[PDB]
Amino acid sequence: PQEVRKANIIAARSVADAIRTSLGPKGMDKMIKTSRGEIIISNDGHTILKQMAILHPVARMLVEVSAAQDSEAGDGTTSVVILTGALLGAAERLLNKGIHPTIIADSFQSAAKRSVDILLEMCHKVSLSDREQLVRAASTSLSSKIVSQYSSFLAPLAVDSVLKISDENSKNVDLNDIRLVKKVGGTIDDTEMIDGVVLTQTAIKSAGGPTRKEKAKIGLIQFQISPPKPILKEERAYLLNICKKIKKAKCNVLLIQKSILRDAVNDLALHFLSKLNIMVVKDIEREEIEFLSKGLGCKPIADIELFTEDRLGSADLVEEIDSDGSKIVRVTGIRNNNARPTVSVVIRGANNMIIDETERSLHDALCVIRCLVKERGLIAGGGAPEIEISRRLSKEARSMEGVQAFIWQEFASALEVIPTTLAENAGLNSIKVVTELRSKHENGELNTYEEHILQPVLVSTSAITLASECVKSILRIDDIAFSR
Amino acid sequence: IYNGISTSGLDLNNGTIADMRQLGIVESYKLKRAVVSSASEAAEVLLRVDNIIRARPR
Amino acid sequence: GLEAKKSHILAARSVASIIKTSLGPRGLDKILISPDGEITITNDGATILSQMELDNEIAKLLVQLSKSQDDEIGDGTTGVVVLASALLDQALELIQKGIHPIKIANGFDEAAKLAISKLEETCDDISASNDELFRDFLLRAAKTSLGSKIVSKDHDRFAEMAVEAVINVMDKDRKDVDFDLIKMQGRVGGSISDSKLINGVILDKDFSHPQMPKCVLPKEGSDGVKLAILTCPFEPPKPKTKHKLDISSVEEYQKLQTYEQDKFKEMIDDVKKAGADVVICQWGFDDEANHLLLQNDLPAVRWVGGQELEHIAISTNGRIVPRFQDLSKDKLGTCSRIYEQEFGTTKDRMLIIEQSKETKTVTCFVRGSNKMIVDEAERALHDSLCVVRNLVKDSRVVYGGGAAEVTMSLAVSEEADKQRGIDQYAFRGFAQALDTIPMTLAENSGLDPIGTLSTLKSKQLKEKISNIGVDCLGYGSNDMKELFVVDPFIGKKQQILLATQLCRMILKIDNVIISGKD
Amino acid sequence: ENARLSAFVGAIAVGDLVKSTLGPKGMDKLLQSASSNTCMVTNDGATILKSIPLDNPAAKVLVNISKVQDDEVGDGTTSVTVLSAELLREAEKLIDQSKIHPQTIIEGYRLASAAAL
Amino acid sequence: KGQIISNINACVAVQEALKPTLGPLGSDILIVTSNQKTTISNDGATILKLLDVVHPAAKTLVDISRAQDAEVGDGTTSVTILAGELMKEAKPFLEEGISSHLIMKGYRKAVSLAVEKINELAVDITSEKSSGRELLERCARTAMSSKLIHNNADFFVKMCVDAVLSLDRNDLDDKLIGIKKIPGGAMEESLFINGVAFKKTFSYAGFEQQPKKFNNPKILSLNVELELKAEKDNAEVRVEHVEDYQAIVDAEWQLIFEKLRQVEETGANIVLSKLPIGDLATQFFADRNIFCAGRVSADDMNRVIQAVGGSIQSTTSDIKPEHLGTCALFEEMQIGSERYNLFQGCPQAKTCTLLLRGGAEQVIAEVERSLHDAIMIVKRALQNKLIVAGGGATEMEVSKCLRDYSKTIAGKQQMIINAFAKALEVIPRQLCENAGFDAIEILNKLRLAHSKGEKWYGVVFETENIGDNFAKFVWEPALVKINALNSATEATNLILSVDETITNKG
Structure with missing residues (x-):
C-alpha cells in the first residue's frame, strides 16, 4: 500500500513547499496561467490552490482546509499548508522504520489537544x-x-x-x-x-416615487409587477388589484427579487403607488434573499395569496441618503427582540x-x-508560539514510552519550519535567526510587543488542529480506484 | 484459551491480553450468526465453481 | 559544492549498511569467496572490509582505518563504521539547512569531549571492588565472542590461556602488548581440547634422523639448554669463478677424501666450548651431515622460516652466533628443556619447548577438527588479548552493549540547551546519532528499536541512574550489572575518537578526481 | 484454468477494498470518477462495491450476498466479504498440495459451523 | 573567440580544485593517481603536479606554481587562484568588444603601482617591543590556533623554536628537519631530538641486547652486504663419496671471514646501510657494544653523512679511520610496541629530528602538516626582516588604492584596473568560506573600518569579527606578496594572448 501513500505524500510535499515560499508579504508569489488566458498574481494560498486545478485527489483536501481556515480563524491559510507539509515530510522516515500509520495518526490528534493547553498557559489573559x-x-x-x-x-x-x-x-x-x-x-x-439593515442597490429614480417613507413594513416578496403575459384600462385594472391587496396589510416597502425573465415595476403602477407613498426597491440579488430573511425576521413570499401581515417586518424610518454616485437607503429601528x-x-x-x-x-x-x-487571549507571532511549544516538548518526550516517544521528537522538529520560513523570506539567515530566538528563551518568553505586531490565539490553535486531521485523513486512504 | 481462561480477549488500547468482562467490550451475538450463515452460503456456491459464465448486461 | 555532498552520504551509507546486520553476537554471518576458490564465513567485520576491492573513493577510508583498529582495539571494526554512518546521516539534513560542513566537523569534536567527562563520574572500579573479580572478567572475556560457536562448550579451557599469556608479554609500566610478540599458529586436524598454553616458541621439528633422542640431556648439571641458530648458507666450497668439480676415477677416492674432512675438525671444537645443544639453520641439511653430531648428542634443525626465528631468540633468550672463535657462554640462552610431545592422532609429531621463567613473548597454540574452526578461533583470541590490555591500562570501566550509547545520548542532549549558538543543533544531531547503535542492536536482536530505546531512557531517569543495555542474545533478564558483564572504557573511548576522526575526513573532501584505465 | 484464479484470487481483490475498512480504526478508500470533482471519502463497504464497475464476471456473486445481509441487519455487511475472502484465499492450498473435492470441503464447514455456533 | 572562452572554463576548473585548499582551516582534496596511491594534501604545488592536465592553459597554471615553489616555496595555492580569477573578470569584457590586449596592459600598470605600496606597508622591526626568545614563539602559535593541538600547543612551541635555533640562521630549509610518526601514546609527551632518527622497520630477532645507554659509539657507513648469505645466485656441487658428504656441507663459512675480520679491527660501534642486514651478526656486536640496525631507508642515510661527517665505502679494505664519528649520548624508546633509534648530542649535525606522538596515525598526519605552516613563519622571520600584515590586511588595501588611482586614469584602463581590484576579493572570500564564516557579512563589515585610514585591519580567524591582525600575531613576508602579483600576471598574460589552440597527435 505504500506506493499509493508515498506517491501522494511526495506530490503533496511539492505543493506545500511551493506555497511555503509565499508565506509573508515578502514571500515569493506564484503565477497561474489559465487555459483561457487569464493570469492572476497574489500571495493568497486559498486563491492559488483554487485556480491551480489540481488533479491530485489528496492534494485537493488543502482547499477545504484553507476554506475552513479563513472561515473560522480568518488567518494562516498559507501557514496551515506549511504545517501540513511539514508533518508529511517527517513521515517519510516513519514508514521506513516499520511504524504503522495508526500510531502516527493517533499521536497527531493527542499532540494537538496538549498543544492548546501549553499555549493557554503562556498566553496573557484579556x-x-x-x-x-x-x-x-x-x-x-x-x-x-x-x-x-x-x-x-x-x-x-x-x-x-x-x-x-x-x-x-x-x-x-x-x-x-x-x-x-x-x-x-x-x-x-x-x-x-x-x-437595522442595508440593501445592495438604490431606489426608483423615476418620477412620482417618494423614495422616503416613515413607519413602514418591510417584507420579502417574489412577485413582480408586469402587464398580462400569458387595452390601457385593461392593464391598469389588472394592476389595481395587485396594489389593493398590498394596501390590506399596509406594506409600504416592496422588495422584488432581481430576475432577467420579466421586468420589475411597470410605469403605470408608479402613479398608483405614488398616492399611497409606497416605496419600492428593485434589483434585489439572490444572495440577499437569505440575508434579509434573518435580521428582519421575515419570510419569502412566492405568490400574492401567500402575502400576509404577520410576515411583514417593521421599519421606523426609511429614507434615501443624498450622496454623490451613492444614493444609499438606510433603515433604523427594526424592533426585533428575538433576532439580533x-x-x-x-x-x-x-x-x-x-x-x-x-x-x-x-x-x-x-x-x-x-x-x-x-x-x-492573544499570542504574538513571528515564530514565538511555534518555538515555545518545542521547548516544552523536549523534556516531555523523554516521559513517553514505545513508538509514540519518537513521534514527539519529530513533532517539535516540524513546528520549526514556520519560523524558519519567516526568516528566509526576510532575507536573514534561516538557522542564525532561529538560534538567537532560542538563546534568549531562557530569560524572555513572548518577546515584537514594541513593534505593535499581534496575532490571535485561534489562528495558531486552528492551524494545528486542522493540519492534524488533514494528515490523519491522508494516511487513511491506501488505494485509489476508478469509480463511475 | 487453549488451557482454561476462555473469557480472555485482545485489548486494542493497551495492546495486550486483558479480561473482556472487566473492560466491557462486547459484540452482538445475532451479528455473529448472521456473518457465519452468510459466509457459509456464499462460499458454498463459489467453491463449487469449475467455470465462469459471464452474465448478460441489462 | 552541489552533488558532491549528497553523493558522499549515499555512497558511505550503502557500504556501511552491509555490516549493520552483523553487529553483535546475534548478528548474522556472511559467505565470502576468495579469488582462489575458498569459501570463508565469519562474523568479524575486519575480514569483510579487507576483502572489498572497489574504486569508490569514499569507501576507501573504511579499509585504511580498519587496519589500525585491529592492533589498537580490534572490536572497533563494525561498531565504528555503523557509528560513523550515523554522523553522516545527521549531517545530510544540516547541509540542506545551510550549515557549514566544517562547523559540523568541529561540532562533533566538542560534543565528544564533553561526553567523555560525563562517563568519568558514572564509571566503576574493578581493582577497588576486589582482586579476583578482575580475573573473572578475563575468563568471561572470550566467552562472549565464542558463545555463538561450538567452541562455547570447551570455553572454560581457553579462558585460562589468555590470563598468563598477557602478564608475561606486558609490563605494568607501559601496559602495552606488541603484536609481533604474539605468535599465532594453527593447523588442520585434531580437536580443540588438546590446546595447551606454551610459554615459548613451538618450532615443530622431526629431529631429523630418528636415532636422535626426543629429550635434551642436562649435560652434567649444565645451566639450562643452549641453542645455536645460523642464518649463514652452510654449504660446499663454491668459489666465485671456477667450480667444475668432478671425480675422474677410483684413483681420486683417497686423494680428495682426507683433504676435506680435516677442515670442520677445527670448528667443531669451538662449538663444544660454548655448549650449544642444537643447531638451527634456515635451509635443509644433508643425510650424512647429522651423523657425526649424533655421537656427541647434538641434534640439528633444518627448514625454518625467517619469521619463526624471532620467537626463538626472544623466548629462549638465545642469539645467532656470528663467529665461533669469540663466542662465549655469557649471552647464550638457557631454557627448561626441549622435548617431543605427540598431538592427537596427527603423524606430524610436534614438540613442546618450555621455559619456566617469565619471557617477553608467547606463542598461541590453537587446534581444531576443521580449517574454519581454527581460523575462527585465532581471530577471536586476538580480540580477547586486547581487552585484557585495556582492563590493565584503565581500571575504570563502563557497561556497554547499548547502555553506554544511551547514557552518552542523554548527557549531550541535556547540555545542548545550556550551550547556545550554532553548536546547539550540533549537539542535538550528535545525540541523535548516538541512538543509532542501541537501535541497531535492537534491530539486530529482533525487537522494536524505538520501543526498546524509549525503555532504556525511562529507566535511567525516573528510577535512578544506571547502565542497562540491549540484549542481542537471550539472557535471564535486564541489568547486565547483575551478570557482571563489563566492557573496557578506554576501548569504547578509542572507538568514539576514531569515529569523529573518520567523519571529518569524509566531510573535508568536497572533490573526487580519478583518472582512467588503459 | 483461469476460472479458479478469477473465482479465488480475483475475488480477493474485491474483498481487499473492504478488508482494511473493518473496525472503527480501519482505513478508508477513495472512489474517483472521470471528472474527479464528484469523489468522496467513506468507510462504507456496500457503497464502494456497488459504485465501482466490476468487469470480473465472478465478482457479481458477492454483490447479491451483501444485499441479503443488509435485509437482516444493517451492521456487519463489511465483515461478510472479509470472512468470505479468507476462505477463498486458503482455497489455493486446497488444490495444489491437497487435491480434495470441493463439496467435501463445504461439508466440512457444516460440521465446523455446527460446533462453532 | 570560441577557443578563448573555452580557455576561461579551463582555468576555473583548475581554480575550483584549489579554492577549498586555501587557508590553514581549508578543506583537503582527494586525488587518485594512476599508481593507485592515495594522496591527500592542501598544498597547491603537489596538487597541480599530480593532475598532469593536457590542456595548454591549465598546464601553464601548473608550471607557474613550480616557479612559485622554487624561488619562494610559499603561496603556491594563492598564486593560481589569483591568476585564474582574471579569466572570469575578463570574460564579459570580450563579449562587449573590449580586446584582451588592453586588459593585459592594464595589469602591468596596476601591479607596478601595487608593488610600491607593499614596501610602504612593510615595517622592519626586530628588537622593538620584542625579545629574542619570545619573537619566534609568538609566530608558531598563529598556525597552531583553531586546531586540535591548541590545548597542547604550549609544549609544542618549545620544540618548534629549538628546531630552528639548532641550525645556522644563514641557511635554513624545511627538508632538513626530519619528522617521524610514533603510533600511540600521549601528545604532550613528545620530545625533541638533536640528531637523526629513522623508523626502525627491522622486525627480526636479536632483541633484549644493545641497551639504550651508549658512551661514544663509532658510526661507519656501509655499502655492500656484510652477511655471507647469497640471495640470488647459486651453484651445483655434488660428490659420489660417502664420507665426503659431511665435509661438503662444512665449507662456505670461511669465505667472508677474511673480510669480516677487518671490521673488528676498525671498532665501529654503529652499523647502518641501505640494505637489510642479516641476522647472523646480531650477537657478537653486543659483546663489543656495537649497534646494528637493518632495513633502513635510503633517504635517512644521507643525513648520517651530514651529521658525524662519515663516508660511504664499497668494501671494508680501503675504509679510512677518520671517516668514523661519534655522538654525545644515545637513546632508544620502546613506546608504541616498536623500538626507535635516535642520536643525540652531535655538534657537527646539519639536521635534526622531531618526534610526534598521538592517538592515531591519521591524527598525527594532521598535526605534522599543521606544524609545517608554522615552520615557514619561523624560518622566514630570521631570513627576511621585512614583513607585511596578512590575513586580509594587505589584500584589501591593494584593491582600495587602485580604486582611487583609476579615477585619474582615462580610457578603458579605468574599468580594467577596477576589475583587477575586484578580482582581489576572491582571496579573503575563500578564507572565510573555508573557515566556516559567512563571506557576505564580513565583506560588508570589513569595508567599514577599512575606509577609516588604517591599512592594517585584518580578519580574525578564531572568532568571527573585524579587527586588526597585529594583536592576532599574523605575520607574512614581503617576498611572497610581491612575487604573487608578478607570477599571476605573467601566467595570465600568456593565456589571454593565445586565441587559437592547436594540438597535434603523435
Missing part, C-alpha cells in the same frame, strides 16, 4: 470589556493595506459591532450577517453603522480599487476580533 486592546488589534492589522490614517477611524467601528453581537456564551457568530455594500463615490471618512441586529456598513470611495480592497481588509479585521469571542 477580557472583551477593555477597549484598549480591541482598538489596537484592528488598527495594527490594517498596516498591510493602502489605508493608513483612515485605519484609526474604522478601528472603533469594528470593535463596537462585534461586542454587541458577541454576548458571552454565543461563541461562534455567523459571518453571513455582516454584509459590506461598496459603491463608487464618497470617501472613507463618511461611515454609518445602520444596525445585523451589522452592515456602507463602504464609499472615489476609486474602484479603494472600496474593493477595503472590503477585504475589514473581513480580516472582524475575524481577528471574533477570535477573542470564542477564546480570549
Whole structure:
C-alpha cells in the first residue's frame, strides 16, 4: 500500500513547499496561467490552490482546509499548508522504520489537544470589556493595506459591532450577517453603522416615487409587477388589484427579487403607488434573499395569496441618503427582540480599487476580533508560539514510552519550519535567526510587543488542529480506484 | 484459551491480553450468526465453481 | 559544492549498511569467496572490509582505518563504521539547512569531549571492588565472542590461556602488548581440547634422523639448554669463478677424501666450548651431515622460516652466533628443556619447548577438527588479548552493549540547551546519532528499536541512574550489572575518537578526481 | 484454468477494498470518477462495491450476498466479504498440495459451523 | 573567440580544485593517481603536479606554481587562484568588444603601482617591543590556533623554536628537519631530538641486547652486504663419496671471514646501510657494544653523512679511520610496541629530528602538516626582516588604492584596473568560506573600518569579527606578496594572448 501513500505524500510535499515560499508579504508569489488566458498574481494560498486545478485527489483536501481556515480563524491559510507539509515530510522516515500509520495518526490528534493547553498557559489573559486592546488589534492589522490614517477611524467601528453581537456564551457568530455594500463615490471618512439593515442597490429614480417613507413594513416578496403575459384600462385594472391587496396589510416597502425573465415595476403602477407613498426597491440579488430573511425576521413570499401581515417586518424610518454616485437607503429601528441586529456598513470611495480592497481588509479585521469571542487571549507571532511549544516538548518526550516517544521528537522538529520560513523570506539567515530566538528563551518568553505586531490565539490553535486531521485523513486512504 | 481462561480477549488500547468482562467490550451475538450463515452460503456456491459464465448486461 | 555532498552520504551509507546486520553476537554471518576458490564465513567485520576491492573513493577510508583498529582495539571494526554512518546521516539534513560542513566537523569534536567527562563520574572500579573479580572478567572475556560457536562448550579451557599469556608479554609500566610478540599458529586436524598454553616458541621439528633422542640431556648439571641458530648458507666450497668439480676415477677416492674432512675438525671444537645443544639453520641439511653430531648428542634443525626465528631468540633468550672463535657462554640462552610431545592422532609429531621463567613473548597454540574452526578461533583470541590490555591500562570501566550509547545520548542532549549558538543543533544531531547503535542492536536482536530505546531512557531517569543495555542474545533478564558483564572504557573511548576522526575526513573532501584505465 | 484464479484470487481483490475498512480504526478508500470533482471519502463497504464497475464476471456473486445481509441487519455487511475472502484465499492450498473435492470441503464447514455456533 | 572562452572554463576548473585548499582551516582534496596511491594534501604545488592536465592553459597554471615553489616555496595555492580569477573578470569584457590586449596592459600598470605600496606597508622591526626568545614563539602559535593541538600547543612551541635555533640562521630549509610518526601514546609527551632518527622497520630477532645507554659509539657507513648469505645466485656441487658428504656441507663459512675480520679491527660501534642486514651478526656486536640496525631507508642515510661527517665505502679494505664519528649520548624508546633509534648530542649535525606522538596515525598526519605552516613563519622571520600584515590586511588595501588611482586614469584602463581590484576579493572570500564564516557579512563589515585610514585591519580567524591582525600575531613576508602579483600576471598574460589552440597527435 505504500506506493499509493508515498506517491501522494511526495506530490503533496511539492505543493506545500511551493506555497511555503509565499508565506509573508515578502514571500515569493506564484503565477497561474489559465487555459483561457487569464493570469492572476497574489500571495493568497486559498486563491492559488483554487485556480491551480489540481488533479491530485489528496492534494485537493488543502482547499477545504484553507476554506475552513479563513472561515473560522480568518488567518494562516498559507501557514496551515506549511504545517501540513511539514508533518508529511517527517513521515517519510516513519514508514521506513516499520511504524504503522495508526500510531502516527493517533499521536497527531493527542499532540494537538496538549498543544492548546501549553499555549493557554503562556498566553496573557484579556477580557472583551477593555477597549484598549480591541482598538489596537484592528488598527495594527490594517498596516498591510493602502489605508493608513483612515485605519484609526474604522478601528472603533469594528470593535463596537462585534461586542454587541458577541454576548458571552454565543461563541461562534455567523459571518453571513455582516454584509459590506461598496459603491463608487464618497470617501472613507463618511461611515454609518445602520444596525437595522442595508440593501445592495438604490431606489426608483423615476418620477412620482417618494423614495422616503416613515413607519413602514418591510417584507420579502417574489412577485413582480408586469402587464398580462400569458387595452390601457385593461392593464391598469389588472394592476389595481395587485396594489389593493398590498394596501390590506399596509406594506409600504416592496422588495422584488432581481430576475432577467420579466421586468420589475411597470410605469403605470408608479402613479398608483405614488398616492399611497409606497416605496419600492428593485434589483434585489439572490444572495440577499437569505440575508434579509434573518435580521428582519421575515419570510419569502412566492405568490400574492401567500402575502400576509404577520410576515411583514417593521421599519421606523426609511429614507434615501443624498450622496454623490451613492444614493444609499438606510433603515433604523427594526424592533426585533428575538433576532439580533445585523451589522452592515456602507463602504464609499472615489476609486474602484479603494472600496474593493477595503472590503477585504475589514473581513480580516472582524475575524481577528471574533477570535477573542470564542477564546480570549492573544499570542504574538513571528515564530514565538511555534518555538515555545518545542521547548516544552523536549523534556516531555523523554516521559513517553514505545513508538509514540519518537513521534514527539519529530513533532517539535516540524513546528520549526514556520519560523524558519519567516526568516528566509526576510532575507536573514534561516538557522542564525532561529538560534538567537532560542538563546534568549531562557530569560524572555513572548518577546515584537514594541513593534505593535499581534496575532490571535485561534489562528495558531486552528492551524494545528486542522493540519492534524488533514494528515490523519491522508494516511487513511491506501488505494485509489476508478469509480463511475 | 487453549488451557482454561476462555473469557480472555485482545485489548486494542493497551495492546495486550486483558479480561473482556472487566473492560466491557462486547459484540452482538445475532451479528455473529448472521456473518457465519452468510459466509457459509456464499462460499458454498463459489467453491463449487469449475467455470465462469459471464452474465448478460441489462 | 552541489552533488558532491549528497553523493558522499549515499555512497558511505550503502557500504556501511552491509555490516549493520552483523553487529553483535546475534548478528548474522556472511559467505565470502576468495579469488582462489575458498569459501570463508565469519562474523568479524575486519575480514569483510579487507576483502572489498572497489574504486569508490569514499569507501576507501573504511579499509585504511580498519587496519589500525585491529592492533589498537580490534572490536572497533563494525561498531565504528555503523557509528560513523550515523554522523553522516545527521549531517545530510544540516547541509540542506545551510550549515557549514566544517562547523559540523568541529561540532562533533566538542560534543565528544564533553561526553567523555560525563562517563568519568558514572564509571566503576574493578581493582577497588576486589582482586579476583578482575580475573573473572578475563575468563568471561572470550566467552562472549565464542558463545555463538561450538567452541562455547570447551570455553572454560581457553579462558585460562589468555590470563598468563598477557602478564608475561606486558609490563605494568607501559601496559602495552606488541603484536609481533604474539605468535599465532594453527593447523588442520585434531580437536580443540588438546590446546595447551606454551610459554615459548613451538618450532615443530622431526629431529631429523630418528636415532636422535626426543629429550635434551642436562649435560652434567649444565645451566639450562643452549641453542645455536645460523642464518649463514652452510654449504660446499663454491668459489666465485671456477667450480667444475668432478671425480675422474677410483684413483681420486683417497686423494680428495682426507683433504676435506680435516677442515670442520677445527670448528667443531669451538662449538663444544660454548655448549650449544642444537643447531638451527634456515635451509635443509644433508643425510650424512647429522651423523657425526649424533655421537656427541647434538641434534640439528633444518627448514625454518625467517619469521619463526624471532620467537626463538626472544623466548629462549638465545642469539645467532656470528663467529665461533669469540663466542662465549655469557649471552647464550638457557631454557627448561626441549622435548617431543605427540598431538592427537596427527603423524606430524610436534614438540613442546618450555621455559619456566617469565619471557617477553608467547606463542598461541590453537587446534581444531576443521580449517574454519581454527581460523575462527585465532581471530577471536586476538580480540580477547586486547581487552585484557585495556582492563590493565584503565581500571575504570563502563557497561556497554547499548547502555553506554544511551547514557552518552542523554548527557549531550541535556547540555545542548545550556550551550547556545550554532553548536546547539550540533549537539542535538550528535545525540541523535548516538541512538543509532542501541537501535541497531535492537534491530539486530529482533525487537522494536524505538520501543526498546524509549525503555532504556525511562529507566535511567525516573528510577535512578544506571547502565542497562540491549540484549542481542537471550539472557535471564535486564541489568547486565547483575551478570557482571563489563566492557573496557578506554576501548569504547578509542572507538568514539576514531569515529569523529573518520567523519571529518569524509566531510573535508568536497572533490573526487580519478583518472582512467588503459 | 483461469476460472479458479478469477473465482479465488480475483475475488480477493474485491474483498481487499473492504478488508482494511473493518473496525472503527480501519482505513478508508477513495472512489474517483472521470471528472474527479464528484469523489468522496467513506468507510462504507456496500457503497464502494456497488459504485465501482466490476468487469470480473465472478465478482457479481458477492454483490447479491451483501444485499441479503443488509435485509437482516444493517451492521456487519463489511465483515461478510472479509470472512468470505479468507476462505477463498486458503482455497489455493486446497488444490495444489491437497487435491480434495470441493463439496467435501463445504461439508466440512457444516460440521465446523455446527460446533462453532 | 570560441577557443578563448573555452580557455576561461579551463582555468576555473583548475581554480575550483584549489579554492577549498586555501587557508590553514581549508578543506583537503582527494586525488587518485594512476599508481593507485592515495594522496591527500592542501598544498597547491603537489596538487597541480599530480593532475598532469593536457590542456595548454591549465598546464601553464601548473608550471607557474613550480616557479612559485622554487624561488619562494610559499603561496603556491594563492598564486593560481589569483591568476585564474582574471579569466572570469575578463570574460564579459570580450563579449562587449573590449580586446584582451588592453586588459593585459592594464595589469602591468596596476601591479607596478601595487608593488610600491607593499614596501610602504612593510615595517622592519626586530628588537622593538620584542625579545629574542619570545619573537619566534609568538609566530608558531598563529598556525597552531583553531586546531586540535591548541590545548597542547604550549609544549609544542618549545620544540618548534629549538628546531630552528639548532641550525645556522644563514641557511635554513624545511627538508632538513626530519619528522617521524610514533603510533600511540600521549601528545604532550613528545620530545625533541638533536640528531637523526629513522623508523626502525627491522622486525627480526636479536632483541633484549644493545641497551639504550651508549658512551661514544663509532658510526661507519656501509655499502655492500656484510652477511655471507647469497640471495640470488647459486651453484651445483655434488660428490659420489660417502664420507665426503659431511665435509661438503662444512665449507662456505670461511669465505667472508677474511673480510669480516677487518671490521673488528676498525671498532665501529654503529652499523647502518641501505640494505637489510642479516641476522647472523646480531650477537657478537653486543659483546663489543656495537649497534646494528637493518632495513633502513635510503633517504635517512644521507643525513648520517651530514651529521658525524662519515663516508660511504664499497668494501671494508680501503675504509679510512677518520671517516668514523661519534655522538654525545644515545637513546632508544620502546613506546608504541616498536623500538626507535635516535642520536643525540652531535655538534657537527646539519639536521635534526622531531618526534610526534598521538592517538592515531591519521591524527598525527594532521598535526605534522599543521606544524609545517608554522615552520615557514619561523624560518622566514630570521631570513627576511621585512614583513607585511596578512590575513586580509594587505589584500584589501591593494584593491582600495587602485580604486582611487583609476579615477585619474582615462580610457578603458579605468574599468580594467577596477576589475583587477575586484578580482582581489576572491582571496579573503575563500578564507572565510573555508573557515566556516559567512563571506557576505564580513565583506560588508570589513569595508567599514577599512575606509577609516588604517591599512592594517585584518580578519580574525578564531572568532568571527573585524579587527586588526597585529594583536592576532599574523605575520607574512614581503617576498611572497610581491612575487604573487608578478607570477599571476605573467601566467595570465600568456593565456589571454593565445586565441587559437592547436594540438597535434603523435
